[PDB]
Amino acid sequence: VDREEMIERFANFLREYTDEDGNPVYRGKITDLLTPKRSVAIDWMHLNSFDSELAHEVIENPEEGISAAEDAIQIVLREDFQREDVGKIHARFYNLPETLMVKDIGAEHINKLIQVEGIVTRVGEIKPFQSFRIQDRPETLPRFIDGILLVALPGDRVIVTGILRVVLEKTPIFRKILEVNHIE
Numbered sequence: 001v002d003r004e005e006m007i008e009r010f011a012n013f014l015r016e017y018t019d020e021d022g023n024p025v026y027r028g029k030i031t032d033l034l035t036p037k038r039s040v041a042i043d044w045m046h047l048n049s050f051d052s053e054l055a056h057e058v059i060e061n062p063e064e065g066i067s068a069a070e071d072a073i074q075i076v077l078r079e080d081f082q083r084e085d086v087g088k089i090h091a092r093f094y095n096l097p098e099t100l101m102v103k104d105i106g107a108e109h110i111n112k113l114i115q116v117e118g119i120v121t122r123v124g125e126i127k128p129f130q131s132f133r134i135q136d137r138p139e140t141l142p143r144f145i146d147g148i149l150l151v152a153l154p155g156d157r158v159i160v161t162g163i164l165r166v167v168l169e170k171t172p173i174f175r176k177i178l179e180v181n182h183i184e
Helices: 003-016 025-031 044-050 052-060 062-081
Strands: 039-043 090-094 114-126 129-135 144-149 157-169 173-183
Touching (some): 003 025, 003 052, 025 039, 025 062, 039 062, 044 052, 052 062, 062 090, 090 157, 114 144, 129 157, 129 173
Parallel strands (some): 039 090, 144 173
């Protein structure tokens, strides 16, 4: 619900979630940061099985939900591993409950964390960002959306999560783009 509560609840999830074998998956993903990875990829269905309220909040209030998850990673690093100097670690959510085709993206998807399937038709770089043009896959027929990431090459089929942002496109319009939270 509120920010402080979400942080505490993410820390509990990271510490206490276990897979079908009783293994604390997210403890391992945290120790991967001490060798290193600079993200923790979180399976949303793991989160939903543990804390369905928190998982719903990630979808409906992504800016706050993602930020809280990141602050929880820092808390666990400090308290459980005595590390405070790893720097910013991104929380990257995948396996959301609904998947959109690019053509399905609408007004109802603003201000949410969304999951989109497509085929990559372009990949570019304008430092420090990577960009992807994500188009409807031919076997679903095309519309496209550009994604910005801070993994995939032209021709690759992908599933991405992210939040809709805009770019001023020069008649000028604010074209919807996706700020990418996770891609595979």
